Design an enzyme around this catalytic site. Structure first.
Site, PDB file in Angstrom:
ATOM      1  CE1 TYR A   1      -4.001   2.169   0.519  1.00  0.00           C
ATOM      2  CE2 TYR A   1      -2.709   3.163   2.314  1.00  0.00           C
ATOM      3  CZ  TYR A   1      -3.817   3.177   1.468  1.00  0.00           C
ATOM      4  OH  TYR A   1      -4.724   4.207   1.576  1.00  0.00           O
TER       5      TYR A   1
ATOM      6  CB  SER B   1      -7.075   2.525  -2.250  1.00  0.00           C
ATOM      7  OG  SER B   1      -7.731   3.761  -1.949  1.00  0.00           O
TER       8      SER B   1
ATOM      9  CG  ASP C   1     -14.377   3.290  -5.764  1.00  0.00           C
ATOM     10  OD1 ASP C   1     -14.520   4.128  -4.870  1.00  0.00           O
ATOM     11  OD2 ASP C   1     -13.296   2.715  -5.921  1.00  0.00           O
TER      12      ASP C   1
ATOM     13  CG  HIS D   1     -12.649   2.445  -2.315  1.00  0.00           C
ATOM     14  ND1 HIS D   1     -12.005   2.721  -3.499  1.00  0.00           N
ATOM     15  CD2 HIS D   1     -11.708   2.522  -1.340  1.00  0.00           C
ATOM     16  CE1 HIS D   1     -10.722   2.924  -3.259  1.00  0.00           C
ATOM     17  NE2 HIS D   1     -10.516   2.815  -1.958  1.00  0.00           N
TER      18      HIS D   1
END
Ligand SMILES: *[C@](O)(CO)[C@@H]1CCCN1C(=O)[C@@H]1CC[C@H](C(C)(C)C)N1C(=O)CCCc1ccccc1
EC number: 3.4.21.26
Length: 710
Positions: free
Chosen positions: A473, A554, A641, A680
């Protein structure tokens, strides 16, 4: 293998914008309109080639059957007590949404309290937030449809689970806090806006207000208690102190872990709550975080990062508020990050630290901060906890790479504190003893040591032959800690895979200095860190480039898309979920303005100079070398989303397919899948989770030609 054609996609060659002297072309700008016939046709044409590609090989079915079988296990939350009753979330195994249960004693028969599964045929209505009244007799809960951040709050009386008429609309990113008089609840809402508010729009979210709803009234009577019309990005979240005397307001602007802290002594209100509260601006800047732990009269205990990157506990007396007067109750640790803190049984504090990306849990005395008890845990994460000030017991939930989860209970009235296994579940079919987790530390480009977890079958030869799945991430102070994933363990067991998770800079693993090491001018450190993770796996013989898959969601979708562009020779396959791809325009949409604290904003010349260099949308380039192409790439997004608007993935795939897809040497597929009635990710029903992971590992299997191992 490439037995389909990419759709024809119009390029608006007139879409030219000046950014501080740099001309940027945006030929797919028109995909920013989700409602146009042209955008809807693009989505349909893309899904029309993706779906058959994914479903051609028998492995999708094999994976889906094994996923459905192994994901089918009892899944519990921690018990929590509210007033006279206990509650817990429970899924029998394959229910689209977990169900809330109640019982009148820890030993008594439980019954269904709230079951979201009956609110839709397909599980696409989900709980998003809830709060019980202080006495536990009333219950407020948020529902989101199709994965949108938009919430509707509804209400129940707990006794008999009775539906009440109160309904609060236009709720997003909201607090839920009941005053202890039981009269009503604070919550946040956004003003009315033109067009849709359902999760399909891209409209920016500004001027969030704080309201109070009196139970038994219409929303239109709600009282406005805080608003910031000169500061349209400020978001003010309310909570009551443990004794019910104070409203605390945490005002945020952006995603940085910092907040203003205002308070309102509710007893000092002229006639109860009737308008803008008499706020006392205790901390009136964004220099530090102040997370409320508990109070004793005017002595307020807060978890803070102020002068303390690894976090600490401080006492601020409201009657002697200057910084020089604050007491340091539990000092910052030199390496260990204080993740969260709770007060329980009046005068205990429960502290949860992160020590090299593994959780510890300790009990401390409130009066002095002194350590009293360590709760022993294996290597992994604490992912659930219950126990507030009035409670005389705690529950906590532990998970790791190889075990689903154990819920412990501990009776805090006992002289000797001995936690006990309260619930434990065995996923029969994946023997934990067959696999090992290792943690290594690899140097990045600038020589910084980055942690990485690697999970693999015992006794494998490090001969570089294995498929590998590397996850990252890298942003927003979020730590990526061990978690149980059935879907990932099938990759290991049935596709012979090696799993890795790199704890790259930008995250919170080593406190604010780690976060600060992967933001703003230094965002490139994340990508460098992640590339180096791949190169470590290759050099050490876990995998080779051709067999390596990377994945992120993301901000992690940004991470893998950028890595695809910067080092296409390093990876065989890239799966980018709900990713931020247009770094020049992200701030224009829905809640995107809040991410400028990590990314910067293109309106600034300085920031534009950072952003242009790694923005996935702006860095698609045919590799110069003849023998090098782009990896196989799959973008996953969904039409609701509203966290990361799908235009990011739409424009990016359109660019990938035009710049790289049309070259003769590109045989690796560049695809997108756009799901319906999903957002999302949060609240996604089980059926969709299973379809999703099936899609992803089928893509990997087909692109790398991996055999299924029964
Ligand atoms: C994804 O990475 C993660 O889902 C997207 C894209 C960039 C950041 N991002 C978020 O969802 C951010 C990351 C932090 C925060 C939470 C909800 C995951 C903690 N994100 C938000 O967007 C929250 C938006 C509402 C908000 C704004 C400001 C303060 C609090 C909450």
């Amino acid at each position: 293998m490439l037995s389909f054609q990419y759709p024809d996609v119009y390029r608006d060659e007139t879409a030219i914008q000046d950014y501080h002297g740099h001309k940027v072309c945006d030929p797919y700008a028109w995909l920013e309109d989700p409602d146009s016939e042209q955008t809807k046709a693009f989505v349909e044409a893309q899904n029309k080639i993706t779906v058959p590609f994914l479903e051609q090989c028998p492995i999708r079915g094999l994976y889906k059957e094994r996923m459905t079988e192994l994901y089918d296990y009892p899944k519990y939350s921690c018990h929590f007590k509210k007033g006279k009753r206990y509650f817990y979330f429970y899924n029998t195994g394959l229910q689209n949404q977990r169900v809330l249960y109640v019982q009148d004693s820890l030993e008594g028969e439980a019954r269904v309290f709230l079951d979201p599964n009956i609110l839709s045929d397909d599980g696409t209505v989900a709980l998003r937030g809830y709060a019980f009244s202080e006495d536990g007799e009333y219950f407020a809960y948020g529902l989101s449809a199709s994965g949108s951040d938009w919430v509707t709050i509804k209400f129940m009386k707990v006794d008999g689970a009775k539906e009440l008429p109160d309904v609060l609309e236009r709720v997003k990113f909201s607090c839920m806090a009941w005053t202890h008089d039981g009269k009503g609840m604070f919550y946040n809402a956004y003003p009315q806006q033109d067009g849709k508010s359902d999760g399909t729009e891209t409209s920016t979210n500004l001027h969030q207000k704080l309201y109070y709803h009196v139970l038994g009234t219409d929303q239109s009577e709600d009282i406005l208690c805080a608003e910031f019309p000169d500061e349209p990005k400020w978001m003010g979240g309310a909570e009551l102190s443990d004794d019910g005397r104070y409203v605390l307001l945490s005002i945020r602007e952006g995603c940085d872990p910092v907040n203003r802290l205002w308070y309102c002594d509710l007893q000092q209100e002229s006639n109860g709550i009737t308008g803008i509260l008499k706020w006392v601006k205790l901390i009136d800047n964004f220099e530090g975080e102040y997370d409320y732990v508990t109070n004793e009269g005017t002595v307020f205990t807060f978890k803070t990062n102020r002068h303390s990157p690894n976090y600490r506990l401080i006492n601020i007396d409201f009657t002697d508020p200057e910084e020089s007067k604050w007491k340091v109750l539990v000092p910052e640790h030199e390496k260990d990050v204080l993740e969260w803190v709770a007060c329980v049984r009046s005068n205990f504090l429960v502290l949860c630290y992160l020590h090299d990306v593994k959780n510890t849990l300790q009990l401390h005395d409130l009066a002095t901060g002194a350590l009293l008890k360590i709760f022993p845990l294996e290597v992994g994460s604490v992912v659930g906890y219950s126990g507030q000030k009035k409670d005389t017991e705690i529950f906590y939930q532990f998970t790791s790479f190889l075990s689903p989860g154990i819920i412990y209970h501990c009776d805090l009235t006992k002289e000797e504190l001995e936690p006990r296994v309260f619930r434990e579940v065995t996923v029969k079919g994946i023997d934990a003893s067959d696999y090992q987790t290792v943690q290594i530390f690899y140097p990045s480009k600038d020589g910084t040591k980055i942690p990485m977890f690697i999970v693999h079958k015992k006794g494998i030869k490090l001969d570089g032959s294995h498929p590998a799945f590397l996850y990252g991430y890298g942003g927003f102070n979020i730590s990526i800690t061990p978690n149980y994933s059935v879907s990932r363990l099938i990759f290991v067991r049935h596709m012979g895979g090696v799993l890795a998770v790199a704890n790259i800079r930008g995250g919170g693993e080593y406190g604010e200095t780690w976060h600060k090491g992967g933001i703003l001018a230094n965002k490139q450190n994340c990508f460098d860190d992640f590339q180096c993770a791949a190169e470590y796996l290759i050099k050490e013989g876990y995998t080779s480039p051709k067999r390596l898959t990377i994945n992120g969601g993301s901000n992690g979708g940004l991470l893998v898309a950028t890595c695809a562009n910067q080092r296409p020779d390093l990876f065989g396959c890239v799966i980018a979920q709900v990713g931020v791809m247009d770094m020049l325009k992200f701030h224009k949409y829905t809640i995107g303005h809040a991410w400028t604290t990590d990314y910067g904003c293109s309106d600034s010349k300085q920031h534009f100079e950072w952003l242009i260099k790694y923005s996935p949308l702006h860095n698609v380039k045919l590799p110069e070398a003849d023998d090098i192409q782009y990896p196989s790439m799959l973008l996953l997004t969904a039409d609701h989303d509203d966290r990361v608007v799908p235009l990011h993935s739409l424009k990016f795939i359109a660019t990938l397919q035009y710049i790289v897809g049309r070259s003769r040497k590109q045989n690796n597929p560049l695809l997108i899948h756009v799901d319906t009635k999903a957002g999302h990710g949060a609240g996604k029903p089980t059926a969709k989770v299973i379809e999703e992971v099936s899609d992803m590992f089928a893509f990997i299997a087909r692109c790398l030609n991996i055999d299924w191992i029964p």
